[PDB]
Amino acid sequence: MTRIILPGKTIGIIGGGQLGRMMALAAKEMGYKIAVLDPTKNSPCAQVADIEIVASYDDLKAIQHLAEISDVVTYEFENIDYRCLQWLEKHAYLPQGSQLLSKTQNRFTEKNAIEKAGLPVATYRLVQNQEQLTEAIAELSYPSVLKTTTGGYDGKGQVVLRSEADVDEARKLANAAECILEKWVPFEKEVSVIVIRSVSGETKVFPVAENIHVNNILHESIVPARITEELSQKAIAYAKVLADELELVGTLAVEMFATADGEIYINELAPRPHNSGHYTQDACETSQFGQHIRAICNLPLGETNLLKPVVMVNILGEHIEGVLRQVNRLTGCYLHLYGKEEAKAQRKMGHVNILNDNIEVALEKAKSLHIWDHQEQ
Amino acid sequence: MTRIILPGKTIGIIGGGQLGRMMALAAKEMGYKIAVLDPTKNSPCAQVADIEIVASYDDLKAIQHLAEISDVVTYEFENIDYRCLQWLEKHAYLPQGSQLLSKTQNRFTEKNAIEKAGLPVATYRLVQNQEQLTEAIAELSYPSVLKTTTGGYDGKGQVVLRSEADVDEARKLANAAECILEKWVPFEKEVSVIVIRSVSGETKVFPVAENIHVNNILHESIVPARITEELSQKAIAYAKVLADELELVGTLAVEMFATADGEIYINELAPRPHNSGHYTQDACETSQFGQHIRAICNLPLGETNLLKPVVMVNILGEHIEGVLRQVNRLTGCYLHLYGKEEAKAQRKMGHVNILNDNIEVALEKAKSLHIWDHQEQ
Ligand SMILES: [Mg+2]
Ligand SMILES: [Mg+2]
Known part of the structure; x- marks a missing residue:
């Protein structure tokens, strides 16, 4: 206390x-x-x-x-x-x-x-068997997405239902695990906000990041997020509401969808430092890790000011060889590697924070390195 | 290479x-x-x-x-x-x-x-015996400082000569060790610059820091140094030329005296990360430590941009209790503690980087904490 x-x-x-x-x-x-x-x-x-x-x-x-x-x-x-x-x-x-x-x-x-926090989410239905999947599809229609309710991404995780042709694949998943079906809500970009709240109730929010996923794995986080000032303000307010309603102590990562018409839907939550907050190690006055420690120890929180624009790029097992071969080209890039011994294709091995006054120059840098050709496609 | x-x-x-x-x-x-x-x-x-x-x-x-x-x-x-x-x-x-x-x-x-590298220092004379001390006093006059040529660690090991009354104390020093006598520089500020040079010859220079010493121990480093643009440019230029002429690989701290009349004299060198560069951990795009590693490993060097003004304040054994008691008052302050068990009075136990858009506010914050009243006097 x-x-x-x-x-x-x-x-x-x-x-x-x-x-x-x-x-x-x-x-x-x-x-x-x-x-x-x-x-x-x-x-x-x-x-x-x-x-x-x-x-x-x-x-x-x-x-x-x-x-x-x-x-x-x-x-x-x-x-x-x-x-x-x-x-x-x-x-x-x-x-x-x-x-x-x-x-x-x-x-x-x-x-x-x-x-219960009064924030918007995509319409959703619990799916525990084929009858419930059928009813859920009938109620929500296409497009929709079926996701396992608990941690089980490794190999499957989700089925996107664009039409009736994707139902067979969804049925298989529905048998394998408890699921929710969510209506696919159209959006322009995915964003996230890291909120920190200490034991004594002090609350800080980091800048809104724009996230780019490839095969449902985070590829890039872009800060500042390329969204309107009003969307940024709403995203930040939403995060504060969650921290207060969930009686947060420590760190909460709030992933969001931002629509063309200026609305925000809450996607999912993580009660910990999050991949989409790694940019903070090099671009903010305090990192999310430093903040998390301060929060649980009940020290004054650090400031969360964005000190320079940044693109974080993930280094998966498939990228590590390319990173090491291209180390000489990492000017303006801040490399973080996690000390994992065995590389597997989709395993998270590290990240690089690319700092530049211009966010588009940072993005172009990532492309120019050609390490992430698979993601770019 | x-x-x-x-x-x-x-x-x-x-x-x-x-x-x-x-x-x-x-x-x-x-x-x-x-x-x-x-x-x-x-x-x-x-x-x-x-x-x-x-x-x-x-x-x-x-x-x-x-x-x-x-x-x-x-x-x-x-x-x-x-x-x-x-x-x-x-x-x-x-x-x-x-x-x-x-x-x-x-x-x-x-x-x-x-x-020999072409840079200015205060006029100085080698003192290997009493006769050489006498001659040096004659040539340099008062005021002057006699310092031992080696043994940089504690115990003063120096004698300031303002009058003939101080000669007695100096003779004793010159009797115990080889010395150098230096003409006293009437300076306004002490400043330092950290320069980095990688194995391949890439160079980066950090901003000029203003250093405040108390009892021959660093108390505060202030960045940006409170000096003219002309003095800053000169200190940086001097540091670059030194790095080049000495064929630096790694880290070099160049400590200097800055006079009111805009002259710089080189004081002393440390071929390593230095206390006067700790500010870089929280205020710069790359820290002197990140830079040192990159330099010796021959990675591309990071940028040295000052991202926010900073006052670094040293935490000695005599300060640690005050820091721990005042921990709830450390907003805008970034605490670093080194994990030393034994807390001797003048032992460096950690440092705190106080970040603020206004340097005077940062200085004020250090004083208002009432931890360093001894140093402040
Ligand atoms: Mg979750
Ligand atoms: Mg030295």
Whole structure:
């Protein structure tokens, strides 16, 4: 409430991926110690942490060990079972709580929470079997999109239904997992806003980013987003409403659709630093990682001013060879690589923040490097 | 020339203090592994390193061990002896070389090198005995400063001569060590410039910083330095010429005196990241540490644009309690703490970068915190 976790103390992180690694690096600058729990040895985060606990996320015993050596605990792994987070908020210090994670983990529960906040979402229906899929298609028509309610993107995730010809594919998915069908709402661009709220209630919002996805993987984030001032203001206001209604502590990434007629629909939420906020490491006065640490520790939040326009480009497994071969050409580019040993095609290996006074020159730079030819097409 | 050290390789650092730690943090963002050699276990740098070697700086076997596991070797500790330096330069990869470091270890050698590069310094005389002191006093008159040529660490090691009354104290100093006598420069401001030069000869120069020393220890760096455009241009030009003439690879801090009459004299050089460049971590497009890594690894250098005005304030052992107590008042302030256990009174425990569009507001903020009343007086 007024509880402050002072520099020198230990922050425990559940999950050792790139998000935890970058949380850790930010915390280290401020003089915090870092403990991490991850199922695989020498994770990106372990490479920066003082203490490594190699164990499963459901390993209640190892979770207790993390709780014992930590003064505060946060998570970066978003598919963690919220029963484990319920244990921590009662027996350790987890200022984020378990509630928000539980609401944002399931696309259906997520939509209900956005609606209760009074914000606009695409019309949606829960799909648990073929009869329900049929009814949902009949009610919402085409175009629509079927998405699994919980984390299961690896190989499938979603089916876009442009016409009746895509129904066969949707039925297969509907059998494989619980789904929601959402009406496809026409939009000009996807945008996101990172909002941070500390234990003491202090709230900061980062600049609106314009996101470009390829095969449903983030390719580029563009800041400032190439949208109207009024859309930017609305996006920012929407993020503040969510932080307050969801009683946020820590970080919330709000992904959005911006339509040609100036409206914003809330797409999805992530209760953590998000890929679309990586630009902040090089372009803002505080990074989202530095902010997240400040939020949970209850330090004054840093400023979120955009200090230079930026295009973040993702480096997937398929790009890493190209990046390393082209290192000599990275003038004006700020490389971040996560220390993952095995490259797989779609695995996130790093990102590059391209800073320029002109956003179009930054975009042209990414194209000129030809590392992302596959994405450009 | 062409040699590039790619992300994924190991950077070895001789010296595990805060400069090593901040080098290592910048390197980790880019996906490098870190090895460190330091006389004390659990050093600031070891807290972020993948491999720690605990040994003396003059222990050639340990130095050799660090070199053997490192793809490139750099140093934070300057007083490496010649036998270790030659071994490193010829049998490891030490792109910085030994030549520049040799020149900057002796105040007389250093001033000769600066003059030979075509740059101005205060008039000076070598003092190896009492007779040479007498002659130098005669030629330079009062006021003047007698300084030891080596041993840059604590204990003053200097005597300011304003009258014949001070000669007695000076003779004692010249009796214990080789000295240099320098004519007193009537200066308005102390300033410094950080210059970067990569293995391939690419150069970048950081903005001029105004430095405020108290008890021979840096207190504040102010950027932009409160000096005329003409003085700024001159300091930058001088720093570039030095980098060229000394064939710098890596980082060079050039400390200077700026007079009211618009003249610059070169004071002293540090062939490494420097305390007067810590502001770059929060206020510049690239930090001196990010730049140092790029320079030795022969990556393209980042930009050095000042993105927001800044006051860096040092946190000594005598300040850490005040910082921790005032943590809730650190809005607009960016805290860096080095992870040192033992807090001696004059030991550098961290720094705070105070960012503000108005330099005077930043200065005011430092005072209003009432942490540095001692320095303020
Ligand atoms: Mg979600
Ligand atoms: Mg020096």
